[PDB]
Design a protein around this ligand. Structure first.
Ligand SMILES: *C(=O)N1CCC(CNS(=O)(=O)c2ccc(Cl)cc2)CC1
Ligand SMILES: *C(=O)N1CCC(CNS(=O)(=O)c2ccc(Cl)cc2)CC1
Ligand SMILES: *C(=O)N1CCC(CNS(=O)(=O)c2ccc(Cl)cc2)CC1
Ligand SMILES: *C(=O)N1CCC(CNS(=O)(=O)c2ccc(Cl)cc2)CC1
Lengths: 290, 290, 290, 290
């Protein structure tokens, strides 16, 4: 029985890679028509998947960059129990494998990282493990701070307790309306069968917290250049973390753009925001490439 | 500001009633063309709503029965925080008010109860509080026993603990595929904006457990006639409870029909099951009416 | 088999009374040689017992007051599981029974209350239930406030959790050196076989907390006259509660005496403190009696 | 300020050693008058101390064995917070240091281990780490199995929970009457100011559980000869563990003696038991020495 995606598609019929844990990961690529000037890995957030970055990737591809990605373990078309991971570092390790693989085929090319939410945390931790290895990082409402509301020192304590007693315990529920102010995208979001909307599991929320702790420790050694995109009304990733990221990161090349009133999914928000986001990412990456 | 449904429709524009807690409840009616031979209240399950019984109600209406219902508090178009109730008895109290109201307009008419899942528990508790008052009860995979898997003496203990620390804590996630084997209805189920699919809250799961405890105590005094419809593969309401209901209830008029392999939502299952269900309910109620 | 004390002495051989719960309570009396001018019930603290007030009682007896007492349920020579009570109010109820019994034999006589620690809480709650019934109250480092250290909003939450899971769970350990600065009495305290030094049980700590809550609510209606004796270095009953008691109680006749550096057991502290305590209690009660 | 024992005696005035954690441990020695035929380390149980083995040690000394010991960290006259240890292995590590020190001064001499309760677990783990290094082991009601009553899979789970929330949380209370049937020794036990009777702390109970887990894993590789002394009525260390120890240990030289009705502290039990214990230990060790 050939290995198949959680949606029953055989892996031999799709682009993929096998991780250190022997798990198949669904891969995605956007190769420019000619010799690429640089490489860029896209890191998606929790529950979502790599296919959600189709248009963003097509814009980057139009700049002559070889865009690539894969669905994190337990996500999209990749193997593994939905939204669960032995340890958060697995996400980083897998990213490095994919990056290391792509760099071998395209030697001497600069490598950028693009991450959103949990994807942002992964990106930060990826560069933090390889100082001076990446050319730049594009962060869209990255996970850097614990929800001052959804995760207080008390709720974290309780979650840790649940982890010992009811680890497999699934939580919830999160209103998809806090993702974007664009109703179309909210519907689109609820219609995606590759997305996961089954509420954060206990053991996974712990990992998410591990991620934030790790990111905070990493910041004093983060030197990679970055573009930080954040919305003021982000109820998932508080803008407080964005300002803290700008302050605590040691990077010499760091930019912050705030979108007043915007929500979480900046790249899938109101046309006026999405347009600026796409544009800003374009200008930023363009200047850092040649 | 006139009171409006959770979906923003003013209550003065829909049939409704105001409960003892001063909360508006959305009402639904199916009045036969001529003098009704009997009355029948429909009690929906958790998360769902009264509109889901359109066809079942139309069949009953065709038998000359005045069908009526309302969305339980915190459900459908009724007021109240989604899937929460101060105490389970509130559901019963409200049913009695609606029944008491309808009986006043149609004196001397017999009154039946139709309940599914949590709705079944409510029905049982309603008749148990008014012995010899109802003519009959139709139960579709009623809530009578605690999930031997989802709620063991340990998980119940943990839930009770969570109730003290994280009461407002929402849970999850429940796969909608365990509801029916009919894919159309599963999609239909996920498309209903009146239905609630945000995972069982902690404080509410407690109430659900209160319900089961109360039902067990009530059974030794339950004398109302009933038709019990249950599926063998029900992962929400184990068939064990059905057999126990047949054995522990004191009723002199009690019937049990098992649907081999069928799931939870019997009235929305495979055509062959739904057809028999509708038919059996028809024959059963018909014989008890004149 | 005639009922015997927890130490195996038959109750028919000692002064006693039987409470509403059918439990035997060991009684103690100090009757003046002639007609008593007033009655005074002594309420001991947790773990300890009525025999610990021998000398204090003998001084009061020398003032022509009929002193009386009994070991609270689950204490000293009284029946009941060590340091456990269905509800704190039981302590109050039993006090009233004993007071009501003694008043019948000595009609028209004024009635005072003397309480220490938990005994103080009981005294306050006793008078609060019978406004204008008692002539006065003598409070020695009374239980009125929750240990700002041993019981924070978090520890209380945890205790409540333990009450559901591990109610019978016994705690600990409390250093007897925090009771008094007088080493002799500390040794004396550890040598008493009637005293309980087995650490506070979970279910009992809850009751203790109930007591504090009840006392706080009662204070706005407490009108009984009182003498408040408190030590600055009391690590069991923080002096903060004493000042709060002086402020929150409505009594028109309220006095506070602070013993600088003194510990918990004021009546069993350094000679200089104990001497003043005995003296102050003497003067205070004397003026209120005739 | 020279380091002093918890009882204020300077360490320079007593025999001692400094552990790997820089903590002072109170040492005790019983050196025969002439060249010793072997060495024997005594491992005391929880709360107690090395001085409790005075007579046992004097008997062993009379057999020409160099007896030695030290109070485990957080015990007796040794430094460290009462009844707490970073990890159970610390106890083993310290034993090896003391053994390694003594062996250097007395090269080529065989080395025996004597342990009671928690002391027995330490002894087993000490030999398990150094297979074929010790000549023999004398075990008195050793800690090998979790209290089927005081520690069920549920209570262990709860304890682990407490470890995360209330680690410093002290427990209780343990009736000293379950130690021995000899009332004199029970009094003696309660009179010892070097003994600890402040109830088992949460973080420490965890370690105790770690110990049992470790012992069970070690048994399949335990080859050291041993004498196992156990009482049938031991409520602290169930005799079940003794039989399991006899069965699960791989040792070729293993003996078991059961004392019918006897309690925990076999060496401090009824004269008839203590006499046999001392005698049996004498015969057993004598045969294994020359
Ligand atoms: C982006 O992909 N995300 C998903 C994860 C959320 C919440 N992360 S967190 O605030 O660190 C958190 C972790 C664990 C719990 Cl239980 C609650 C909150 C941020 C946006
Ligand atoms: C019908 O409407 N339902 C909804 C409720 C389920 C589960 N009820 S239960 O098994 O009693 C339960 C109560 C509380 C918890 Cl946390 C888990 C399970 C039955 C079908
Ligand atoms: C006087 O008799 N006492 C005994 C009781 C103590 C502690 N009472 S408390 O601070 O309300 C408390 C209750 C429950 C817990 Cl678990 C801890 C502390 C006061 C003096
Ligand atoms: C000998 O020294 N002892 C002291 C320790 C006891 C109990 N040990 S246990 O049964 O493993 C246990 C560990 C932790 C908890 Cl919370 C309860 C019981 C055996 C004799």
């Amino acid at each position: 029985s050939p290995r198949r995606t959680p949606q029953s598609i055989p892996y031999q019929d799709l682009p993929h890679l096998v991780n250190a844990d022997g798990q198949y990961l669904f891969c995605r690529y956007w190769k420019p028509t000619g010799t690429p000037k640089a490489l860029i890995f896209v890191s998606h957030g929790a529950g979502e998947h790599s296919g959600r970055y189709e248009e963003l990737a097509r814009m980057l591809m139009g700049l002559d960059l070889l865009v690539f990605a894969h669905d994190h373990v337990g996500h999209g078309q990749s193997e593994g129990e939905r939204m669960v991971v032995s340890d958060f570092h697995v996400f980083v390790r897998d990213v490095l494998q994919h990056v290391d693989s792509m760099q071998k085929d395209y030697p001497g090319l600069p490598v950028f990282l693009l991450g959103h939410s949990m994807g942002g945390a992964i990106a930060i931790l990826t560069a933090a493990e390889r100082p001076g290895h990446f050319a730049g990082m594009v962060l869209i409402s990255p996970l850097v701070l614990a929800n001052p509301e959804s995760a207080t020192t008390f709720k974290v304590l309780a979650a840790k307790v649940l982890n010992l007693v009811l680890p497999n315990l699934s939580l919830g529920p999160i209103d998809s309306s806090v993702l974007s102010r664009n109703k179309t995208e909210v519907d689109i979001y609820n219609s995606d069968p590759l997305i996961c909307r089954a509420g954060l599991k206990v053991c996974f929320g712990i990992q998410l917290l591990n991620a934030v702790s790790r990111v905070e420790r990493a910041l004093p050694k983060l030197t990679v250049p970055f573009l930080l995109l954040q919305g003021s009304a982000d109820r998932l990733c508080d803008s407080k973390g964005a300002y803290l990221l700008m302050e605590l990161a040691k990077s010499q090349d760091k930019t912050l753009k705030i979108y007043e009133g915007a929500y979480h999914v900046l790249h899938k928000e109101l046309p006026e925001v999405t347009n600026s986001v796409f544009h800003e990412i374009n200008m930023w990456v363009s200047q850092r490439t040649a």
